[PDB]
Design an enzyme around this catalytic site. Structure first.
Site, short mmCIF file in Angstrom:
data_model
loop_
_atom_site.label_atom_id
_atom_site.label_comp_id
_atom_site.label_asym_id
_atom_site.label_seq_id
_atom_site.Cartn_x
_atom_site.Cartn_y
_atom_site.Cartn_z
CB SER A 77 21.84 19.75 9.78
OG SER A 77 21.60 21.13 9.58
CB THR A 90 25.72 25.15 6.89
OG1 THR A 90 26.24 24.90 8.20
CG2 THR A 90 26.70 26.02 6.12
CB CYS A 91 22.63 24.52 11.36
SG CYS A 91 24.28 24.09 11.95
CB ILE A 92 18.63 27.11 9.27
CG1 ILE A 92 19.57 28.29 9.48
CG2 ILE A 92 18.13 26.57 10.60
CD1 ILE A 92 18.89 29.53 10.02
#
Ligand SMILES: [Zn+2]
Ligand SMILES: [Zn+2]
Lengths: 261, 194, 609, 93
Positions: free
Chosen positions: C300, C578-580
């Site tokens: 993401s 950043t993905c979480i």
């Protein structure tokens, strides 16, 4: 299922609700709430007088003549239910059980509603001059005068509510019965030939729409923010729109009064 | 003194013009209200905080009564009634608060606290006007419970000694107004005040 | 348990009142709806129809008096409190807007009793009246029902127009002068039947905030319709979530970080996707995935980095690859852009077309796309009718300068004054267009303006600067959003709602950030972020969640932002996933030196997985 | 108030209460609340059952006000208290 001491139908033995009111009428037969899966055992321990069905054409014709010549539809049975109330319970009970069939009540009920006298007795059943044998009233002849008043006031309405609830909620079957009930009501509500009939049909419609409004409110309050039971209540109001709006106006007024004061 | 609260001394009642005025409707709500915090402070001190010298209360009622029967001066009668009515509203406010705080005479002492006894002296000497004003004060307390107006609040104990009652009263009465730039408990308590 | 019963009785009352209104709506159309469909129904005349209405009204009069008196009393109290806030000062801890309003049981009751006695003779001065409006929800059921009765009986037997009569912009449209007043819950007044709904404005504002889950769940609640951002964004967040999950076809994007190649790569794939599709059929996608090369890792956070990355390419004012002028500029306040028409080549249409899709893609998956737009260009995207009030958002200087012109034309001497200016129906373009006088109407150069048609002249200046000069980009940028989002998904939200959902919060609000993120070390961390400069908060969030801004709602983080405290180590540096959106900071027992690690990590501007 | 209260309805009952509508020492009170001179005995007899619960449930709060008609129509429960306490005070005297 039912159990009978006299016939010995006990433990695993049981008799169906149709055998209880014919084969075991007057016995020590009581309903039991166990083991919902079963089948009738009436013939194994009793001479079952329910295994034979007669000529169906003659049964209906006999019902037609009794509803015309006699005045028998007004008398309630030993459990206090007027004939119309008994029939509506049968249809609701049958339509659930008969769905388990792997290859009269509907016709009688649809015929009894068609005559004015049965509707007049059912709708005004709890009302005074009509007495339920099992009710706590109609025993007022030995109490003090002040006790007898406070009881002439107030009119029985539990039986009417039970009948109205079944035809709307419990009788989830076809709508023919509900339209038939309104059809004879509206016809008797616009008849100018028989004297002293308009004002009687008005009062009957008032009492009936009071029961529908009571049922309609409880269903709507219970549910969150269209179900068939509500849709049936809505249809009744539309067919009698002049007489439904004023009845709802008083029903709403009773609910907000304790909040207002 | 009594007609204070009206007019402007130091409060948002003063400076209600453009600085505190966003289109005319701002003043309309600011107007139509008369201050009584300053009036209540004077009344509470004279009834509660002062001692039992009972000479200032007689002096205050002496001049009010004298002007309530003055005729040779034109217009004096009308302003005497308006002054008297506003003063009696203030005494009723203090009397209700004081009586609500204290508990009933459960000890059979048959003694009424001095601050309340001074409130009754004002009402008796001005009987026609005090009866009229107590009628409206009672109506204000019971009107919310005539409907569902609520404001539930919370239950509170009742003071048995005088000192505890004078404690609660002065917190809400010795207060500076402003500078310029559970439901059943509330119903039962309001019903007790009525 | 009293209020629960009273509120239940008020709900049962409302169910009946609706039926009377619903039944009375069938009276005019009885013979076509009821009498024909139902085999057995009564017949209705006309005389009993009017008699029926009189019966209903006389029954409802006692309830009308009960509700109106209560609603009038509460409205006067609420309005009087707002009057005291303007006149009184902040500070003194009895001001309604002071911190405290956000005590013994004996003390609490005595104030209520005192307030009632003071407000009977309307003394009630300099003190905020005591009012627990949360206890009036059984009243709100009654009032909402009776409005439903009269909001439908009226049929049985906005966009502010005014052009003239100006007021100074400081308090006419305050949103235009300070564009930073866009809180997620900002009151509408601060930014800028029918008579009863407007008579109780303040009361209906408190309702719908305290009484929205119950009341507002009803089938005809006004509070649901009167609701602003909080109810409209939740409805939309479900609206495009329904269309996101249903789709079973996904699209893959592939670009590089280099500025010139990024635009070339992004266009090269978007048009290819449209090649296999049709203009009528929307470009709805399950999910579009883009991965930057020379840096392994997909997730993401990569997607969020892309939307910022593509935005900066068009945000900047330098040239672009030919396959020619920059396609945006700020005519008014800084940050809000308007399309640049230029030579109007076919390649420019695609560039304005393809920037439309990324706006729709960002809304579809609910990230943030930092392409800030003026109010007028946002409005034309949604399809609302442009008027002469949002021109104040185009710039404050010109409308205010033009506002004095109408105001001056209200005097007879202005005719002599108008002779001095002797303006004609011609406008010189800005240095952006290279200048040049343009005629508003045919032969307008020879026709000088007069005070008579100042009414007429003003409206010809605006839309010439609004629509025609940007006719082809506004018509081109539009189907960019159109081809991705359906027609019937954006009508509800206004131009003001659209900005908050696309661009998020205008500024990185720390006070909202603390309530969004979850974990003595924190207090040092919170003090550091309070004083750190505004210029590099965007980088920190860009470091945090690969985006320079914040979503305008708590839900806008999928998943919620979290920070984890690793065991102490003064050698390592904080790392963000950043993905979480998870930030790991070593447990530092120092405050000032810890800032050095944060600044060092922020300046990296790099991501990896 | 001659008619015995029979309807158990708040709406109907409120309708009934509505639709039914010299030397100073010689002054005499004239209670005639909404017509007819009213005696406390008549009201007490009218609301009998409602006043039996009132004096048996609200005995510590409403039965403690000065001059309350809850405590001088009280039964044994209020009678067993004031006699024993009065006796105890005399015993310790
Ligand atoms: Zn048997
Ligand atoms: Zn049998």
């Amino acid at each position: 299922i039912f159990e009978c001491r006299t016939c010995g139908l006990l433990e695993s033995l049981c008799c169906c609700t149709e055998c209880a009111r014919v084969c075991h009428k007057g016995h020590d037969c009581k309903l039991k709430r166990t083991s919902p899966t079963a089948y009738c055992d009436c013939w194994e321990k009793c001479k079952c007088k329910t295994l034979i069905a007669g000529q169906k054409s003659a049964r209906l014709d006999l019902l037609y003549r009794l509803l015309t010549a006699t005045n028998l539809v007004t008398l309630p049975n030993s459990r206090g239910e007027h004939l119309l109330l008994f029939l509506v319970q049968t249809v609701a009970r049958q339509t659930v059980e008969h769905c388990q069939y792997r290859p009269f009540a509907q016709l009688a009920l649809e015929r009894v509603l068609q005559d004015w006298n049965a509707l007049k007795s059912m709708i005004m059943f709890g009302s005074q001059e009509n007495k339920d044998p099992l009710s706590a009233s109609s025993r007022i002849g030995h109490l003090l005068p002040e006790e007898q008043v406070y009881l002439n006031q107030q009119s029985g309405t539990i039986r009417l509510d039970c009948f109205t609830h079944c035809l709307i909620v419990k009788c989830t079957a076809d709508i023919l019965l509900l339209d038939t009930l309104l059809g004879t009501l509206v016809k008797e509500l616009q008849n100018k030939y028989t004297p002293g009939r308009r004002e009687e049909a008005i009062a009957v419609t008032m009492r009936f729409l009071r029961s529908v409004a009571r049922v309609f409110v409880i269903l709507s309050v219970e549910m969150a923010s269209i179900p068939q039971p509500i849709g049936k209540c809505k249809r009744v109001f539309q067919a009698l729109l002049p007489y439904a709006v004023e009845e709802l106006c008083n029903v709403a007024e009773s609910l907000i009064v304790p909040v207002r004061m | 003194m009594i007609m204070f609260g009206s007019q402007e001394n130091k409060d948002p009642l003063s400076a209600s013009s453009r600085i505190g005025h966003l289109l005319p409707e701002e003043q309309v709500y600011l107007n139509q209200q008369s201050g009584t915090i300053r009036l209540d402070c004077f009344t509470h001190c004279l009834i509660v905080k002062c001692t039992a010298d009972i000479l200032l209360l007689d002096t205050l009622l002496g001049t009010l009564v004298k002007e309530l029967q003055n005729k040779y001066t034109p217009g004096r009668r009308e302003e005497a009634i308006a002054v008297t009515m506003r003063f009696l509203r203030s005494v009723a406010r203090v009397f209700v608060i004081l009586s609500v705080e204290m508990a009933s005479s459960k000890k059979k002492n048959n003694f009424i606290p001095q601050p309340i006894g001074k409130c009754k002296r004002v009402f008796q000497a001005l009987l026609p006007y005090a009866v009229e004003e107590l009628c409206n004060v009672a109506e204000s307390l019971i009107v919310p419970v005539r409907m569902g107006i609520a404001r539930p609040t919370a239950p509170f104990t009742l003071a048995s000694t005088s000192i505890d009652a004078m404690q609660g009263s002065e917190e809400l009465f010795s207060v500076e107004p402003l500078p310029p730039r559970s439901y059943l408990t509330s119903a039962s308590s309001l019903a007790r005040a009525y | 348990s009293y209020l629960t019963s009273a509120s239940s009785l008020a709900r049962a009352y409302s169910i009946v009142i609706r039926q009377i209104s619903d039944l009375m709506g069938l009276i005019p159309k009885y013979n076509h709806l009821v009498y024909s469909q139902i085999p057995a129904a009564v017949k209705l005349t006309y005389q009993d129809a009017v008699n029926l209405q009189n019966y209903v009204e006389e029954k409802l009069i006692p309830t009308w008096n009960w509700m109106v008196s209560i609603m009038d009393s509460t409205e006067a109290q609420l309005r009087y409190g707002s009057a005291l806030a303007s006149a009184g000062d902040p500070g003194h801890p009895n001001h309604p807007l002071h911190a405290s309003q956000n005590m013994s049981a004996r003390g609490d009751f005595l104030n209520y009793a005192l307030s009632l006695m003071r407000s009977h003779n309307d003394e009630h001065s300099d003190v905020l009246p005591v009012l627990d409006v949360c206890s009036l929800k059984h009243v709100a059921y009654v009032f909402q029902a009776l409005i439903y009765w009269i909001k439908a009986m009226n049929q049985q037997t906005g966009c502010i127009p005014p052009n003239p009569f100006e007021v100074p912009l400081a308090e006419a449209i305050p949103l235009a002068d300070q564009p930073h007043l866009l809180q997620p819950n900002a009151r509408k007044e601060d930014l800028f039947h029918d008579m009863l709904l407007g008579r109780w404005r303040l009361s209906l504002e408190l309702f719908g905030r305290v009484f929205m889950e119950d009341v507002g769940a009803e089938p005809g609640s006004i509070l649901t319709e009167l609701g602003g951002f909080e109810v409209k964004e939740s409805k939309f967040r479900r609206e495009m979530e329904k269309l996101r999950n249903q789709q079973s076809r996904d699209l893959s994007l592939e670009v590089d970080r280099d500025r010139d190649l990024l635009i070339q790569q992004t266009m090269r794939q978007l048009n290819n996707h449209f090649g296999r599709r049709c203009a009528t059929t929307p470009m709805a996608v399950h999910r579009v995935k883009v991965t930057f090369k020379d840096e392994p890792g997909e997730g993401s956070g990569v997607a969020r980095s892309f939307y910022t990355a593509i935005a900066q390419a068009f945000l900047s004012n330098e040239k672009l690859p030919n396959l020619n002028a920059p396609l945006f500029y700020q005519p008014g306040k800084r940050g809000f852009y308007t399309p640049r028409p230029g030579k109007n080549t076919e390649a420019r249409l695609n560039c304005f077309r393809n920037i439309g899709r990324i706006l729709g893609l960002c809304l579809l998956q609910n990230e943030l796309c930092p392409i800030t737009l003026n109010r007028h260009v946002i409005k034309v995207l949604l399809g609302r009718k442009v008027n002469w009030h949002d021109f104040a958002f185009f710039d404050p200087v010109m409308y205010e300068s033009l506002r004095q012109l109408i105001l001056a034309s209200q005097s007879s001497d202005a005719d002599a004054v108008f002779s001095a200016m002797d303006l004609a129906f011609a406008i010189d373009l800005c240095k952006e267009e290279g200048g040049g006088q343009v005629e508003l109407i045919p032969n307008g150069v020879n026709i000088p303006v007069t005070p008579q048609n100042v009414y007429e002249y003003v409206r010809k200046y605006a839309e010439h600067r609004m629509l025609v000069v940007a006719e082809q980009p506004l018509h081109a940028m539009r189907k960019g959003l159109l081809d991705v989002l359906p027609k019937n998904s954006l009508e509800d939200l206004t131009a003001e709602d659209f900005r908050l959902l696309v661009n998020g919060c205008g500024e990185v609000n720390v006070q909202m950030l603390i309530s969004f993120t979850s974990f003595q070390f924190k207090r040092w961390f919170w003090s550091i972020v309070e004083k750190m400069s505004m210029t590099e908060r965007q980088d920190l969030v860009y470091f945090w969640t690969s985006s320079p801004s914040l979503p305008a709602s708590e839900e806008g983080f999928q998943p919620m932002p979290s920070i984890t405290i690793r065991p102490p180590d003064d050698q390592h540096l904080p790392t963000a996933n950043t993905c979480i959106s998870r930030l790991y900071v070593p447990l530092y027992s120092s405050k000032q030196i810890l800032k050095q690690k944060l600044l060092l990590a922020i300046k990296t501007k790099n991501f990896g997985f | 108030l001659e008619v015995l209260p029979t309807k158990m309805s708040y709406a109907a009952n409120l309708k009934n209460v509505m639709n039914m509508q010299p030397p100073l020492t010689s002054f005499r009170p004239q209670c005639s609340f909404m017509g007819m001179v009213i005696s406390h005995d008549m009201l007490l007899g009218r609301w009998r059952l409602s006043l039996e619960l009132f004096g048996r449930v609200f005995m510590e709060d409403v039965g403690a006000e000065p001059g309350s008609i809850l405590t001088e129509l009280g039964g044994f429960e209020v009678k067993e208290s004031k006699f024993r306490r009065e006796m105890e005070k005399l015993r310790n005297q």
